[PDB]
Coordinates of C-alpha atoms in Angstrom, one line a residue:
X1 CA -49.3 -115.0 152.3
X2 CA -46.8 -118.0 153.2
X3 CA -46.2 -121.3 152.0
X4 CA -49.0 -121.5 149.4
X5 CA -48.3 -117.8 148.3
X6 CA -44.6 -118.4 147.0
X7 CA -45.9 -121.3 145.6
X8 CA -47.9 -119.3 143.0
X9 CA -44.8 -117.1 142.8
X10 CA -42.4 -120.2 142.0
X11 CA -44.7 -121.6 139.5
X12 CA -45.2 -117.7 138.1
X13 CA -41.5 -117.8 137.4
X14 CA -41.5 -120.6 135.5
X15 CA -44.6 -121.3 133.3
X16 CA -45.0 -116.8 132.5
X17 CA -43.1 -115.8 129.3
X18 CA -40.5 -113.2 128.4
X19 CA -41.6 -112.5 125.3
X20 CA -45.1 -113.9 125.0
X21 CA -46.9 -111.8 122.1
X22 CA -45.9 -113.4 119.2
X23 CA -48.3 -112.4 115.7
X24 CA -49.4 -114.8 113.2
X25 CA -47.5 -112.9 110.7
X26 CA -44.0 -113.4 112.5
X27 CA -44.3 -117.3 112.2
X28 CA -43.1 -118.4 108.5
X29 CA -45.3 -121.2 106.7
X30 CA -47.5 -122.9 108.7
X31 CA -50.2 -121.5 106.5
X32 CA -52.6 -124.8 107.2
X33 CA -51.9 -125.2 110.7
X34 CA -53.1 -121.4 111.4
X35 CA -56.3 -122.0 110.1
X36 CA -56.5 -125.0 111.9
X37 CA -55.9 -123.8 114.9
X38 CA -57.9 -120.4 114.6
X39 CA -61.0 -122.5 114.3
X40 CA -60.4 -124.1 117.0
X41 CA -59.8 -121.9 119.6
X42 CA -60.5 -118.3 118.3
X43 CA -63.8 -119.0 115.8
X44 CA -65.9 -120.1 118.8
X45 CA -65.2 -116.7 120.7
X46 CA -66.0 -114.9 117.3
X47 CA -69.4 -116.7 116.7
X48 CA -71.0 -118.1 120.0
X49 CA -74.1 -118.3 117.7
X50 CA -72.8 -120.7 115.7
X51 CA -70.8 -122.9 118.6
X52 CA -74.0 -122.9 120.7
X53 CA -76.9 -123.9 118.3
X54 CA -75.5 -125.6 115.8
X55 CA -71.8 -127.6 116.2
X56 CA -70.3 -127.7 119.6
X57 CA -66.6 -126.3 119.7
X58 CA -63.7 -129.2 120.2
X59 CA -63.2 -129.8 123.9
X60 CA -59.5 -130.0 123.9
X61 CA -56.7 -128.9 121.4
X62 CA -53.5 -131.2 121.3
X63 CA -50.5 -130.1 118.7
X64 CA -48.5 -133.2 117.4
X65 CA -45.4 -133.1 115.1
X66 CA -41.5 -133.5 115.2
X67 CA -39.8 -130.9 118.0
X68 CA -38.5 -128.1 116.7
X69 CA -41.3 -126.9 114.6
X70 CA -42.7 -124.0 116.4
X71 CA -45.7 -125.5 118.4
X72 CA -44.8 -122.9 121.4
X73 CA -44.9 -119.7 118.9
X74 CA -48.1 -121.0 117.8
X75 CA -49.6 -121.0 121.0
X76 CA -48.1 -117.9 121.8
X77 CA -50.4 -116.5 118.6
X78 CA -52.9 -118.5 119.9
X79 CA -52.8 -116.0 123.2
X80 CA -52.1 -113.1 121.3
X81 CA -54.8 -112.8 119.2
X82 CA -57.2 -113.8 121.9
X83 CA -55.6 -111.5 124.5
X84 CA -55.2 -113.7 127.2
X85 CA -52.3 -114.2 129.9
X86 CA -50.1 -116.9 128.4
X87 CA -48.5 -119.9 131.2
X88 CA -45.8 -122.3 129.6
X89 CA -45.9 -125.5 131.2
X90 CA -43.6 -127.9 130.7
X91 CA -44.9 -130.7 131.7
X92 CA -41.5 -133.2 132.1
X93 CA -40.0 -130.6 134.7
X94 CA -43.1 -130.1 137.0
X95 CA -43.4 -133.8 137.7
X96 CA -40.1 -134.1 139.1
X97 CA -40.3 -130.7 141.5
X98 CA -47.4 -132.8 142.1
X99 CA -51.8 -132.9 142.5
X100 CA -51.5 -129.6 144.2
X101 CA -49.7 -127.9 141.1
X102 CA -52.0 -129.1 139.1
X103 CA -55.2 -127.2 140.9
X104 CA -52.6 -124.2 141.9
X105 CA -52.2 -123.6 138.2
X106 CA -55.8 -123.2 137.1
X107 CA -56.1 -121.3 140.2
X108 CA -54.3 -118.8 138.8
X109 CA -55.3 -119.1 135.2
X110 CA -58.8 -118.5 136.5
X111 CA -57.8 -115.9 138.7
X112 CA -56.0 -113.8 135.2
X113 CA -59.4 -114.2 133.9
X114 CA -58.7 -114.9 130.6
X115 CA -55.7 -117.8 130.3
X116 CA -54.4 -119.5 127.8
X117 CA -52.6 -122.7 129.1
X118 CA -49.8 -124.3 127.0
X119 CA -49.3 -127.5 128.1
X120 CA -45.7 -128.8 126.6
X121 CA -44.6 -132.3 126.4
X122 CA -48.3 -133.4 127.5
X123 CA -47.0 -136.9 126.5
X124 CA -44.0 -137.4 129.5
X125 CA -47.4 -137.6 132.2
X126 CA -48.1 -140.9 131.3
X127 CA -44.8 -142.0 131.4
X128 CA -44.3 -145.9 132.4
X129 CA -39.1 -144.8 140.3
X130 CA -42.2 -145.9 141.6
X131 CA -43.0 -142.8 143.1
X132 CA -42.7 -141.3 139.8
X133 CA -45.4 -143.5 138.6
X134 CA -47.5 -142.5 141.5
X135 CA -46.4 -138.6 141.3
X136 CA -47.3 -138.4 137.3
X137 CA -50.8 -140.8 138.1
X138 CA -51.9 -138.0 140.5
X139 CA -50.6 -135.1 138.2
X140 CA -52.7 -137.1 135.5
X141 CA -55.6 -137.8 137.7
X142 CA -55.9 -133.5 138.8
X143 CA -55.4 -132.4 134.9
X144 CA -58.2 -134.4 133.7
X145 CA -60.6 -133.0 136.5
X146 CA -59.1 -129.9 135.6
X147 CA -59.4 -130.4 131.7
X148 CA -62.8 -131.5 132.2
X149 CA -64.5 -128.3 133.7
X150 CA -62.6 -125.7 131.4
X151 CA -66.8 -113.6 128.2
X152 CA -63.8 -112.2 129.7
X153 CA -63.1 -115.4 132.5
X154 CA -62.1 -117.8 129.6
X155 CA -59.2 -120.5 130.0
X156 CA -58.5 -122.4 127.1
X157 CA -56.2 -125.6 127.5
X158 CA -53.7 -125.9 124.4
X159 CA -51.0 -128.8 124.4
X160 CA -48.2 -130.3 122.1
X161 CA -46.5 -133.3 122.1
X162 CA -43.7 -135.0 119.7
X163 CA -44.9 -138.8 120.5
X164 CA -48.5 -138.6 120.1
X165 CA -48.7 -142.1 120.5
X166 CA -47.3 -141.8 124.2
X167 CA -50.4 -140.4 125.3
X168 CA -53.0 -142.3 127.2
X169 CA -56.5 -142.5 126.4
X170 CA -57.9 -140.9 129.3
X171 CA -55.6 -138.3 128.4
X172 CA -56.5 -138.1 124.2
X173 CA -60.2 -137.9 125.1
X174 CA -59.9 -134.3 126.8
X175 CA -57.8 -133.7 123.1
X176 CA -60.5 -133.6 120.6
X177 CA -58.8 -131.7 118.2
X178 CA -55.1 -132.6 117.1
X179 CA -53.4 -130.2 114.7
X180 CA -50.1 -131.4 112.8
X181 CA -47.5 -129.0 112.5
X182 CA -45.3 -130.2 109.9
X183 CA -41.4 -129.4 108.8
X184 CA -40.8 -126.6 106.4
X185 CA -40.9 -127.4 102.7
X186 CA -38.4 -126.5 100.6
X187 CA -39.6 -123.0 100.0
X188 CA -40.1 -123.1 103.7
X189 CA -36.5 -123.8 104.7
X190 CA -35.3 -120.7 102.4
X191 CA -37.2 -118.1 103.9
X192 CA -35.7 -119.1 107.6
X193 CA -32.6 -119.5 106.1
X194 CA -32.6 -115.5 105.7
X195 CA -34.8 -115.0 108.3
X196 CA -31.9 -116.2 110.7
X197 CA -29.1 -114.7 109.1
X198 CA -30.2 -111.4 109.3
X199 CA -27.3 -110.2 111.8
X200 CA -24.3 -112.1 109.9
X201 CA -22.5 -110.9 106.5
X202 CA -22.1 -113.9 104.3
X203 CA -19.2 -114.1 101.8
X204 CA -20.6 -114.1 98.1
X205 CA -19.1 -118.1 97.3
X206 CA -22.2 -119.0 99.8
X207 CA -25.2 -120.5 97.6
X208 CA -28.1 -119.9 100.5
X209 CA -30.5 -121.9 97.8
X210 CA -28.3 -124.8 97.8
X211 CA -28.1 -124.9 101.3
X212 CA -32.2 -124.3 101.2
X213 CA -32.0 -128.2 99.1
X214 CA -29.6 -129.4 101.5
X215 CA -31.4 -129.6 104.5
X216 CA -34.4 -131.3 103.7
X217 CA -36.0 -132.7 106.6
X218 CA -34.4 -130.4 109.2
X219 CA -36.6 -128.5 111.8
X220 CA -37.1 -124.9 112.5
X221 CA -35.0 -125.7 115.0
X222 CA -32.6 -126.8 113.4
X223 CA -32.1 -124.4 110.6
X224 CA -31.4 -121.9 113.6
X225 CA -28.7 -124.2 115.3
X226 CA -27.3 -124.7 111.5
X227 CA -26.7 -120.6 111.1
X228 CA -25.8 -119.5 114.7
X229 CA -23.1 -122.6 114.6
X230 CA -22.0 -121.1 111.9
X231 CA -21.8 -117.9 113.0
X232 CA -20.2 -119.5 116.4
X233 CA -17.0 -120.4 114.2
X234 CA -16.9 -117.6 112.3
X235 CA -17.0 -115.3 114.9
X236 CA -14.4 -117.4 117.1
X237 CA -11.7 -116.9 114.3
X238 CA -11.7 -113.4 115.7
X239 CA -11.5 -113.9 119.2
X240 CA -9.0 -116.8 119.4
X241 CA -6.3 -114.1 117.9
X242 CA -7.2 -111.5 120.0
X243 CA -6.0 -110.1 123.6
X244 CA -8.4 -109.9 126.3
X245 CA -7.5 -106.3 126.2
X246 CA -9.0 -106.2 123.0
X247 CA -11.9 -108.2 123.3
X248 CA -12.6 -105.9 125.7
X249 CA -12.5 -102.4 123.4
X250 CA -14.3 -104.4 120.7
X251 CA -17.6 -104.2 120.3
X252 CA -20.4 -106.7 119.0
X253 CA -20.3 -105.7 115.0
X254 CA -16.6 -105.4 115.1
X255 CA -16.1 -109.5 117.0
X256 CA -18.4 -111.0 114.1
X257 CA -16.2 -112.0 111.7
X258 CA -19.0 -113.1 108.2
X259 CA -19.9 -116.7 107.5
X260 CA -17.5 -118.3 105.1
X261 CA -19.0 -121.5 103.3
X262 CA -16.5 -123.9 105.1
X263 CA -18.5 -122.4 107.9
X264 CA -21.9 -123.6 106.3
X265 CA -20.2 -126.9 105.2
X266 CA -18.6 -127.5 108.4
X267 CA -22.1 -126.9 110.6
X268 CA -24.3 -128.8 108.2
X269 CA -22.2 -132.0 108.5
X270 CA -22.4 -131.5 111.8
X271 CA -26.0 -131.0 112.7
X272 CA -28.3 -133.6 110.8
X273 CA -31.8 -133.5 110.7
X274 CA -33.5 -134.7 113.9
X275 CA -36.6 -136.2 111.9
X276 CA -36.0 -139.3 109.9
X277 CA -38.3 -140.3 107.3
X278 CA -39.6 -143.4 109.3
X279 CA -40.1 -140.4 112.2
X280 CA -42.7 -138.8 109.5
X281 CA -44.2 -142.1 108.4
X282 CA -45.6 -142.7 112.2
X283 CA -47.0 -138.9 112.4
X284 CA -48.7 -139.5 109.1
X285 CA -49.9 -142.8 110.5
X286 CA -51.3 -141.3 113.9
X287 CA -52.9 -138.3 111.7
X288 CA -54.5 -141.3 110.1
X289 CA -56.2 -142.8 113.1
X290 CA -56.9 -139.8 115.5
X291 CA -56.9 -136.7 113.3
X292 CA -59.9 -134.7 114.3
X293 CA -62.7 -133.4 111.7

């Protein structure tokens, strides 16, 4: 106990999930970047045989694409399927609370035998203060030591980053494989559109196909921002009448007022697509030059 032991517990807080088993079958698309990512984490626990006599497994497994895609449910499903204990860490917020983190985390992914460690933001270590620099060099230095030596004590390493090209290439070598994980298509961005308006009632006028169209381009993320702005205004019209006696009595189905599409108009123009086309023209680009076999 002591210093060192609420260390573990401070980092426990932070990098363990809430809600950590997430199912292949609960993420929509992403049909090729499933596969992908089966093979290259689950396939060589499935057939050592194969891994071990005749192609060696991909050291390191690095997800690219534009934010808001999904790339910490899929690692999520990742840990689920394997059944391993799950550690988020983000890696822009643990530089600024060191080399001792570093070797304290896969400590304890070691010690929960089998770990799955989602590296987020793997990009923000090589960064260009100057302690910072010297901070994210030693962070650097104690991940790759750590990278480099990773039946039931398994710890795989799985990171994502939305600036691929922001990683060093010290850093891309423990990465062998790199998995795009793209926008949705337009079938894609119809099936969230439901998906996320599950809980609202939405007035008949509302054309959720033409919406589907409309926001080509935007993110998972962004489709969800899109429908619970809309349900923010639409369920404000009610409160802003009301008493806070009566806010009060109400409860949660009677304060949600449905969507109207002025609602829908009014959050679309206001949330754009955080991906421009040039955006998808570098990943494409990248995909080009580093995409693993």
């Amino acid at each position: 106990a002591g210093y060192d032991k609420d260390l573990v517990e401070a980092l426990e807080r932070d990098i363990v999930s809430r809600n950590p088993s997430i199912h292949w079958d609960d993420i929509a698309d992403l049909e090729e970047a499933k596969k992908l990512l089966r093979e290259a984490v689950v396939l060589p626990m499935w057939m050592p045989d194969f891994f071990k006599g005749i192609r060696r497994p991909w050291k390191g497994v690095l997800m690219v694409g534009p934010p808001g895609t999904g790339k910490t449910m899929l690692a999520k499903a990742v840990a689920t399927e394997c059944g391993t204990t799950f550690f988020n860490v983000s890696s822009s917020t643990l530089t600024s609370k060191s080399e001792k983190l570093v070797r304290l985390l896969f400590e304890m992914a070691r010690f929960y035998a089998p770990t799955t460690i989602f590296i987020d933001q793997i990009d923000s270590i090589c960064s260009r203060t100057s302690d910072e620099h010297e901070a994210s060099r030693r962070v650097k230095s104690e991940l790759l030591i750590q990278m480099d030596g990773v039946p039931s004590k398994m710890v795989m390493v799985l990171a994502a980053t939305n600036f691929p090209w922001d990683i060093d290439e010290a850093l891309r070598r423990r990465l062998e494989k790199r998995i795009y994980i793209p926008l949705p298509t337009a079938k894609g961005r119809a099936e969230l559109l439901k998906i996320n308006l599950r809980e609202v009632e939405l007035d008949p006028d509302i054309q959720l196909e033409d919406i589907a169209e409309k926001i080509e381009g935007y993110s998972g993320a962004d489709i969800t921002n899109v429908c619970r702005d809309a349900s923010l205004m639409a369920m404000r019209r009610r409160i802003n009448g009301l008493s806070p006696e009566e806010i009060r009595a109400l409860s949660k189905e009677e304060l949600q007022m449905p969507v109207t599409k002025g609602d829908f108009e009014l959050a679309l123009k206001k949330i754009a697509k955080s991906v421009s086309a040039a955006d998808l023209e570098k990943y494409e680009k990248w995909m080009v030059e580093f995409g693993s076999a």
